[PDB]
Amino acid sequence: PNIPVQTISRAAAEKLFGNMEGDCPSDWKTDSTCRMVTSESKNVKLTVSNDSAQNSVIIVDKNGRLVYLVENPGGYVAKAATVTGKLVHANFGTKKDFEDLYTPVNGSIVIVRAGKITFAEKVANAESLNAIGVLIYMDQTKFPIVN
Amino acid sequence: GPSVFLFPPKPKDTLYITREPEVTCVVVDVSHEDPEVKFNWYVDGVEVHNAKTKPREEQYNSTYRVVSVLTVLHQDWLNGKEYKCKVSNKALGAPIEKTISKAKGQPREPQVYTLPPSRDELTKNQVSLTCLVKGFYPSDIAVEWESYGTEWSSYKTTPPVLDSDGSFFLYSKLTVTKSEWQQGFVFSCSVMHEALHNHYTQKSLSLS
Numbered sequence: 001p002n003i004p005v006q007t008i009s010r011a012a013a014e015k016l017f018g019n020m021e022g023d024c025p026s027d028w029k030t031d032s033t034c035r036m037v038t039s040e041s042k043n044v045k046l047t048v049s050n051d052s053a054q055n056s057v058i059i060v061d062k063n064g065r066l067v068y069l070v071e072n073p074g075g076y077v078a079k080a081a082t083v084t085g086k087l088v089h090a091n092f093g094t095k096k097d098f099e100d101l102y103t104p105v106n107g108s109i110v111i112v113r114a115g116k117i118t119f120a121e122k123v124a125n126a127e128s129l130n131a132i133g134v135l136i137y138m139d140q141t142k143f144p145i146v147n
Numbered sequence: 148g149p150s151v152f153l154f155p156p157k158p159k160d161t162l163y164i165t166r167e168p169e170v171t172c173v174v175v176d177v178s179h180e181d182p183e184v185k186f187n188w189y190v191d192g193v194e195v196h197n198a199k200t201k202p203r204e205e206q207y208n209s210t211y212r213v214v215s216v217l218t219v220l221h222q223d224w225l226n227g228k229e230y231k232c233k234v235s236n237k238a239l240g241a242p243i244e245k246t247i248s249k250a251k252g253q254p255r256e257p258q259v260y261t262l263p264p265s266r267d268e269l270t271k272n273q274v275s276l277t278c279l280v281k282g283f284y285p286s287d288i289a290v291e292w293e294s295y296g297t298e299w300s301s302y303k304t305t306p307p308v309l310d311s312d313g314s315f316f317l318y319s320k321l322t323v324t325k326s327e328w329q330q331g332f333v334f335s336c337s338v339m340h341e342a343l344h345n346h347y348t349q350k351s352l353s354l355s
């Protein structure tokens with residue numbers, strides 16, 4: 001775990017989707033609103049700080065300038081860092097989901113649904129492909145982890 | 148004929164010792180026949196040679212644009228030294244002289260106040276956050292809006308306006324989507340001015 005991981009609300013996710021392009025595979029039985037990648041002109045910036053008060057998810061100008069405040073997550077995952085990149089959806093962040101994935105993860109922030117596998121695994125799988133950060137959201141529909 | 152425009156350094160560059168401030172002598176129209184431009188720089192009447200001429204560059208209207216940049220010392224600029232740019236051309240009847248300096252007066256500290264959107268402005272999908280910066284001298288000032296340590300792209304700042312007491316004021320307008328305002332996020336107005344302690348102050352604003 002050399003990369004920041006952060007939990008976001010369903011609302012924050014959908015706001016992020018609002019700024020993404022691509023439609024999800026029909027195979028992920030998702031909502032209409034889900035999207036795959038951020039448009040060229042925007043990137044996301046994720047800040048996890050020793051002060052859990054000032055965690056932030058923000059959408060950024062090519063200039064690093066601020067476009068949209070997306071959330072200030074109150075929760076934390078048990079690396080303190082600030083990272084800026086493209087955001088890429090990887091569904092459950094299974095190794096399988098990853099290998100099927102059209103858009104390459106390298107150097108990008110990844111967003112995944114909480115789901116089939118542990119958070120720990122999702123982060124590792126992503127980190128394994130050189131993602132620079134991980135967002136995790138709970139859709140209401142629930143997919144208990146198997147062990 | 149060529150036209151000459153002499154510009155002052157950016158406020159932050161003059162205020163921060165970590166930064167490098169420079170005066171810019173811009174030459175707007177440069178003939179195709181006579182492209183030659185001689186630049187001569189003077190500081191308080193004393194000629195200096197520290198300046199660099201950028202490459203000449205043909206514009207969209209068949210006119211060369213020659214720029215000469217001279218780096219100034221922070222306190223030389225702040226004390227009110229004059230920088231004279233002399234442009235010499237064969238296309239000029241006589242060489243053109245332009246002079247800039249800092250306004251020489253007692254510095255006055257800027258008052259920074261943030262205002263929230265008008266109740267009538269909440270009808271719209273986007274709202275304006277206002278930053279009033281007043282009662283400062285000289286005109287040299289730098290204003291940024293930011294949230295969570297990140298500078299805002301969507302904001303614009305009126306030029307300084309001369310007040311009745313000989314001071315300046317201005318406004319900065321940050322435009323945000325209404326929902327971002329209603330959610331109770333914090334916006335900050337950052338102001339850099341020589342009269343301020345550490346040439347810096349900050350005002351925050353959010354939903355009550």
Ligand SMILES: *[C@@H]1O[C@H](CO)[C@@H](O[C@@H]2O[C@H](CO)[C@@H](O[C@@H]3O[C@H](CO[C@H]4O[C@H](CO)[C@@H](O)[C@H](O)[C@@H]4O[C@@H]4O[C@H](CO)[C@@H](O)[C@H](O)[C@H]4NC(C)=O)[C@@H](O)[C@H](O[C@H]4O[C@H](CO)[C@@H](O)[C@H](O)[C@@H]4O[C@@H]4O[C@H](CO)[C@@H](O)[C@H](O)[C@H]4NC(C)=O)[C@@H]3O)[C@H](O)[C@H]2NC(C)=O)[C@H](O)[C@H]1NC(C)=O
Binds near residue numbers: 152157175206207208
């Ligand atoms: C071919 O195409 C070229 C490009 O389109 C074009 O060049 C242009 O030439 C015109 C003249 O025709 C010249 O006009 C002057 O511009 C001055 C300000 O320029 C600023 O802002 C513009 C607008 O964004 C920028 O484009 C410029 O680069 C410059 O920006 C600044 O640049 C510096 C260094 O690069 C940076 O440090 C700044 O951060 C940066 N700013 C920005 C926005 O990024 C403008 O002030 C001039 O106005 C003054 O003079 C006029 C007389 O000509 C008066 O009408 C007016 O009142 C102003 O008077 C001044 O009043 C001041 C008040 O304090 C006093 O201080 C002064 O004493 C007083 N001076 C004078 C002499 O009156 C003026 O508009 C353009 O800037 C120049 N470039 C561009 C991009 O247009 C060629 O001319 C074209 N050919 C032809 C046929 O025209």
